[PDB]
């Protein structure tokens, strides 16, 4: 007598001033699930169509967000903008004018934290990604659907947008929603997954009736509600801070990665969203692939208020030239070099207050962060020709240590040398800040962090994980 | 320096309506001058144009209903940063 999706987002231990904007179809605002909690702005920008069907999509979704019996964040205030017509269709221009209306509403009558839900998608748009971005740098939390096309979400908007939470769907057996050639989108542009198949919500047929619907916007709806509750417990959260908590509190490694194309399984995060029960936060960022040149660089970057503590690389080929941490625009950035099929740059983006971080590039018993009180958070390594706690080890290679001055920070280095894939994970309570491979009797093509597990792929190989805690 | 963009999923394109996006530092009265300048020069060529909306608050620019033929003309307008053909979005 509790819908599967609501139980899934309940953590294994568990014990308003936020507003949630919604852009899609019309709404049955006098449906008992959502009645009184959903102000219909009556904003409208919908294309001409080429009655109970008109509001089915949005009624369901406002119900998933705040419905009285089947909503995630009951008691959340919602405002409704109409951007999709009766056939579920809208335009980018309609969605810009809609997002613009939200920001000018917020300037003209400010309120608390704002959570804009974008339960729509079209092809990659420069203009729509710019608008979501500039709205997010204003301090508004945008949550979006990954897309329903069994594809890479980076090819769609606003799913691919910078600084929007992109959510793919999963079903009651913790596997990706797939239906023929349709199904959830995936890839480095998907931030996490949420319940999105067989989701029971308010049905626009009656004021009391319910329907079961499926979609990446249903997954997005759980997360907008999780964020709405998150932002009332701690209204001061920046979007970087929220996304780190969203990742941290998710269920990790439950999805069956075999449902994704082979090349997208590393790029797709194995996270299923969950509410917080009742710290040092790190997330792994994957780069937009560089290219096939021998002089080829890909770049993964952290949020503005997010420090970069490690950097690594992955070549599906093996022929790689490493990675290095460099300052750009005043920010630490991770850059991976190709030999060469092509490479990814895998950054470890952490939230650390009261900490100054710096890169120390030197050869490989030396210590790189010799300044007393500084911690070694991550080791990078790059070379040009193709042939002991605060120390980075190498072979002919130039090392790029990242060292932070941090009072409460405590760091330990676990290693494990052995094959295709070697793993070593930080103990429970520690956060993996840096993941690196130590060479040997086998060529290694990459090392990347998967939550708190360090993963090195080879074809003797040593995985080297740096773990840090607070006190 | 000003570039044009349009959706790759060809059946989602919406030709004839364009989002003119000006540079970051452009003021709303500058954006309206630039948009009426387009209609001014498009009228000289015997084209009718409709400014459907002028943007400000998130990005500077405007939304114009016009022929794609005017895209060379519109790319050379001052302050222009890029132009993008309107396209369809769908409920997910």
């Amino acid at each position: 007598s509790i819908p599967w999706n609501l139980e899934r987002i309940t953590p294994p231990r568990y014990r308003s001033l936020v507003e949630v904007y919604l852009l899609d179809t019309s709404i049955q605002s006098d449906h008992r699930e959502i009645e009184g909690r959903v102000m219909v702005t009556d904003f409208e920008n919908v294309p001409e169509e080429d009655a109970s069907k008109c509001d089915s999509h949005g009624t369901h979704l406002a119900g998933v967000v705040s419905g009285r019996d089947a909503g995630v964040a009951k008691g959340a205030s919602m405002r409704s903008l109409r951007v999709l017509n009766c056939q579920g269709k809208g335009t980018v221009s309609g969605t810009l004018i809609g997002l613009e209306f939200i920001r000018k509403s917020q300037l003209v009558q400010p309120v608390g934290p704002l959570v804009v839900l974008l339960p729509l998608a079209g092809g990659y748009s420069r203009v729509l990604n710019a608008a979501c971005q500039r709205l997010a740098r204003a301090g508004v939390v945008l949550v979006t659907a990954a897309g329903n096309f069994r594809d890479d979400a980076c090819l769609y908007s606003p799913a691919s947008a910078p600084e929007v939470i992109t959510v793919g769907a999963t079903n009651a057996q913790d596997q990706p929603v797939t239906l023929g050639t349709l199904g959830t989108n995936f890839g480095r542009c998907v931030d996490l997954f949420a319940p999105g198949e067989d989701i029971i919500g308010a049905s626009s047929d009656c004021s009391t009736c319910f329907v079961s619907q499926s979609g990446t916007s249903q997954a997005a709806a759980h997360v907008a509600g999780i964020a709405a509750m998150m932002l009332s417990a701690e209204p001061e959260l920046t979007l970087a801070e929220l996304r780190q908590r969203l990742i941290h509190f998710s269920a990790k490694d439950v999805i069956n990665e075999a449902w994704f194309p082979e090349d997208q399984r590393v790029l797709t995060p194995n996270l299923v969203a969950a509410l917080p029960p009742s710290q040092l936060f790190c997330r792994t960022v994957w780069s937009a692939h560089s290219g096939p040149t021998r002089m080829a660089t890909a770049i993964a970057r952290c949020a503005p208020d997010e420090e970069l503590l490690s950097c690594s690389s992955f070549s599906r080929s093996g022929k790689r030239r490493g990675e290095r941490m460099e300052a750009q625009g005043g920010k630490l950035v991770c850059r991976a070099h190709n030999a060469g099929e092509g490479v990814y740059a895998i950054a470890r983006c952490c939230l650390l207050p009261q900490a100054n971080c710096s890169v120390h590039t030197a050869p490989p018993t030396r210590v790189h962060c010799h300044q007393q009180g500084h911690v070694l958070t991550g080791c990078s390594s790059h070379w040009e020709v193709e042939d002991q706690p605060n120390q980075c080890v190498g072979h002919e290679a130039s090392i790029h240590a990242s060292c932070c001055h941090a009072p409460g920070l405590e760091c330990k280095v676990k290693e494990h040398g052995i094959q295709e894939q070697v793993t070593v994970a930080c103990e429970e309570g520690w956060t993996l800040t840096g993941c690196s491979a130590l060479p040997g009797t086998s060529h290694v093509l990459g090392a990347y962090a998967v939550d708190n597990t360090c993963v090195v792929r080879s074809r003797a190989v040593t995985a080297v994980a740096i773990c840090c805690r607070s006190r | 320096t000003a570039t044009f963009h349009r959706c790759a999923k060809d059946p989602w394109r919406l030709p004839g309506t364009y989002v003119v996006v000006l540079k970051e530092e452009t003021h709303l009265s500058q954006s309206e001058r630039t948009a009426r300048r387009l209609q001014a020069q498009a009228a000289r060529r015997g084209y009718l144009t409709k400014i459907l909306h002028v943007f400000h608050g998130l990005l500077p620019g405007f939304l114009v209903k016009m022929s794609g033929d005017l895209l060379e003309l519109a790319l050379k307008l001052p302050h222009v940063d890029y132009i993008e053909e309107d396209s369809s979005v769908f409920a997910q």
Binding site: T25, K53, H57, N171, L179, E197, D198, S212, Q213, S214 | -
Partner: peptide, 10 residues
Amino acid sequence: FVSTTDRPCG
């Protein structure tokens, strides 16, 4: 799954 997004699910 529904057309507004009529096959069944689970």
